[PDB]
From a paper:
Murine protein serine/threonine kinase 38 (MPK38) is the murine orthologue of human maternal embryonic leucine-zipper kinase (MELK), which belongs to the SNF1/AMPK family. MPK38 consecutively comprises a kinase domain (KD), a ubiquitin-associated (UBA) domain, a TP dipeptide-rich domain and a kinase-associated 1 (KA1) domain. Activation of MPK38 requires the extended sequence (ExS) containing the ubiquitin-associated (UBA) linker and UBA domain and phosphorylation of the activation loop. MELK is considered to be a promising drug target for anticancer therapy because overexpression and hyperactivation of MELK is correlated with several human cancers.
However, the activation mechanism of MPK38 is unknown. This paper reports the crystal structure of MPK38 (T167E), which mimics a phosphorylated state of the activation loop, in complex with AMP-PNP. In MPK38, Thr167 is substituted by Glu to mimic the phosphorylated state of the activation loop. The overall structure of MPK38 (T167E) shows the KD and ExS, which contain the UBA linker and the UBA domain. The KD of MPK38 (T167E) adopts the classical bilobar protein kinase fold, which consists of an N-terminal lobe (N-lobe; residues 1–91) and a C-terminal lobe (C-lobe; residues 94–263). The AMP-PNP, which is an analogue of ATP, is positioned in the ATP-binding pocket. The UBA domain of MPK38 is a small globular domain that contains three short helices (α1–α3) and binds to the back of the N-lobe. In MPK38, Thr277 and Leu279 of the UBA linker modulate the αC helix from the ‘out’ to the ‘in’ position via a strong van der Waals interaction with Arg65 of the αC helix and an additional hydrogen bond in the vicinity; in detail, the O atom of the hydroxyl group of Thr277 interacts with the Cγ and N∊ atoms of Arg65 at distances of 3.4 and 3.6 Å, respectively. Additionally, the phosphorylation-mimic mutation in the activation loop triggered reorganization of the activation loop and the interlobar cleft into a more closed conformation. The activation loop in our MPK38 structure is partially stabilized because the glutamate does not completely mimic a phosphorylated state and the interactions with the surrounding residues (such as Arg131 of the catalytic loop) are not stable.
Author numbering: 2 to 156, 169 to 181, 187 to 331
The structure:
Amino acid sequence: KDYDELLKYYELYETIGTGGFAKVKLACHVLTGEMVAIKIMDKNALGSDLPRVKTEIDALKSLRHQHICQLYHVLETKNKIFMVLEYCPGGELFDYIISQDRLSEEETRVVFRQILSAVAYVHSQGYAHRDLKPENLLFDENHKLKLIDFGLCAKCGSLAYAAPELIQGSEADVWSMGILLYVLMCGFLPFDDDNVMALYKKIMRGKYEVPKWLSPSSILLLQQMLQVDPKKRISMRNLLNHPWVMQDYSCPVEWQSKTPLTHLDEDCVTELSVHHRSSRQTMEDLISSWQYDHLTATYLLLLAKKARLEHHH
Ligand SMILES: Nc1ncnc2c1ncn2[C@@H]1O[C@H](COP(=O)(O)OP(=O)(O)NP(=O)(O)O)[C@@H](O)[C@H]1O
């Protein structure tokens, strides 16, 4: 039905996750054999919340980056919206933290630099994420982080990660990254309560426990990021070459995209052109329209496949 058009292009596997808006299914793009994750949303059930989806969709169409979960295909039927995404099988950063209880400062730095790369890129494109937290960061096959859930992108979110100025746009993401840092290094939240009023007061207050295993450097960074006054809160740029961030690193954080679509891959175009019964020139013209239809998705998945193969060649 709504699924019949989808099943032209994908064969559906099991549900692998859910959220407040979407049921997420593993699937396989038939033409290329590539696995993907499909967000399924019901328009009728979403109702007045639907703009969030069109928000996420328009955001993701203009974001392309190593640490951003890629959007391949958008499909609307009478009752459903389907978003076909890069499959990340490593699960959430959340579950990883719980598995390790807490991360070492060193592995925290490795993770944090990737988060920072993604968020700095997102800002470079004029957005703020507004829902940064370990649940919205997924591990891919190579244990690399991929940011998801862009429905709150603005050109808001879980309270424990929400900045003070926002519960009464760049500075906010910085705050949330501070909370995330704390969580990675500590295994728990700095501001936590079952009572929302209590939690709120704790946040506006800005006082948190500082455990013995933490380095002075990281303690400082935290206090720079968890400044209740956004005016006093550290800026993205200064986060990008902050000494804690740069510790044991001769490289500043490369937030710039490593995956821009500069120009069309010949092999991929060729492969598409055969299946499409059109010349390569024609296919080039078509692909450049970037409609996020089946053509777009096939092209990008062929590209991802090729990259994966080139990594083992
Ligand atoms: N690309 C993906 N690869 C693997 N698992 C995914 C992927 N996208 C989502 N998931 C899983 O599905 C869950 C729900 O995704 P999510 O995008 O947060 O749903 P949502 O309803 O649209 N947003 P939210 O209600 O705020 O969580 C995630 O927490 C993951 O467990």
